[PDB]
Design a protein around this ligand. Structure first.
Ligand SMILES: C[C@@H]1C[C@H]2[C@@H]3CCC4=CC(=O)C=C[C@]4(C)[C@@]3(Cl)[C@@H](O)C[C@]2(C)[C@@]1(OC(=O)c1ccco1)C(=O)CCl
Lengths: 252, 12
């Protein structure tokens, strides 16, 4: 009985294509080379994410400072979640599918300084697999991650932001219903999926701690593109000042 | 700050 197009059908259209890393595999691997290549790939994925965000109806109506703030707070969440999805979709295995030309399997995970990080990232694909998340559920959840963290004192366009966020909570519900599954358990699954969203905060906390550490380490010689370097530089003080507010579904 | 980000958000 819906006479309008579904929001999720739009999200399917604006989802950016998978980017290639441009990794040279004719030469032996090294942790430094892989990390640098992934950082450069990340920079381009984040640029693509800006275009994506601007195509979400209402996002461009937010104050420009708010648009900026949301992307600064959630870029890692967005990147890690998409990584989890590609990894989940591509294999059966315990692998990380950063790009079609840069896949990290169990072997490559043994490279120096890579095990713990890959484990934290594999958690996302593990959870998506456990809950058998659908593409439509995934797309709605990814929007909610963009809207998952705000400044301690809120946004300038707080009222419009809240309406947009509620809209995608509703849309996530619609995706659950559209999903081929147990009808009487929709509300339980709603809890489970928003629980997963809550846990992405800790996933991001871990990945950012190591990212910040690497970014500040002058001994490792790992390159960052302008996009990530600017965001990281701007965010480090905020996490220190406690200027952050995670919007949790299941905690105060 | 985040000059490239602002640039991308504010462009046609
Ligand atoms: C643990 C961090 C988290 C990593 C990002 C996760 C999210 C992400 C997904 C991508 O597909 C591409 C790039 C990033 C944005 C990553 Cl892989 C890189 O910049 C690289 C990042 C920051 C990171 O990655 C790794 O150490 C890493 C990935 C695989 C093994 O180690 C790093 O600090 C290196 Cl400078």
């Amino acid at each position: 009985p819906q006479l309008t197009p579904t929001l999720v059908s739009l999200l399917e259209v604006i989802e950016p294509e998978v980017l290639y890393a441009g990794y040279d595999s004719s030469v032996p691997d090294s942790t430094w080379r892989i990390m640098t290549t992934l950082n450069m790939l990340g920079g381009r994925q984040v640029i693509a994410a800006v275009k994506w965000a601007k195509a979400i109806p209402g996002f461009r109506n937010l104050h420009l400072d708010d648009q900026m703030t949301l992307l600064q707070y959630s870029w890692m969440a967005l990147m890690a979640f998409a990584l989890g999805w590609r990894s989940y979709r591509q294999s059966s295995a315990n692998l990380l599918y950063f790009a079609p030309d840069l896949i990290i399997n169990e072997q490559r995970m043994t490279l120096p300084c890579m095990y713990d990080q890959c484990k934290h990232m594999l958690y996302v694909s593990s959870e998506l697999h456990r809950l058998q998340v659908s593409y439509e559920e995934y797309l709605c959840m990814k929007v909610l991650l963009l809207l998952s963290t705000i400044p301690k004192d809120g946004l300038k366009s707080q009222e419009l932001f809240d309406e947009i966020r509620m809209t995608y909570i509703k849309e996530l519900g619609a995706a659950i219903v559209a999903r081929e599954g147990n009808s009487s358990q929709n509300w339980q699954r709603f809890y489970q999926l928003t629980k997963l969203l809550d846990s992405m905060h800790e996933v991001v906390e871990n990945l950012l701690n190591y990212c910040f550490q690497t970014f500040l380490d002058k001994t490792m010689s790992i390159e960052f593109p302008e996009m990530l370097a600017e965001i990281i530089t701007n965010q480090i003080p905020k996490y220190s000042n406690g200027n952050i507010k995670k919007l949790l579904f299941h905690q105060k | 700050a985040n000059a490239l980000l602002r640039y991308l958000l504010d462009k046609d």
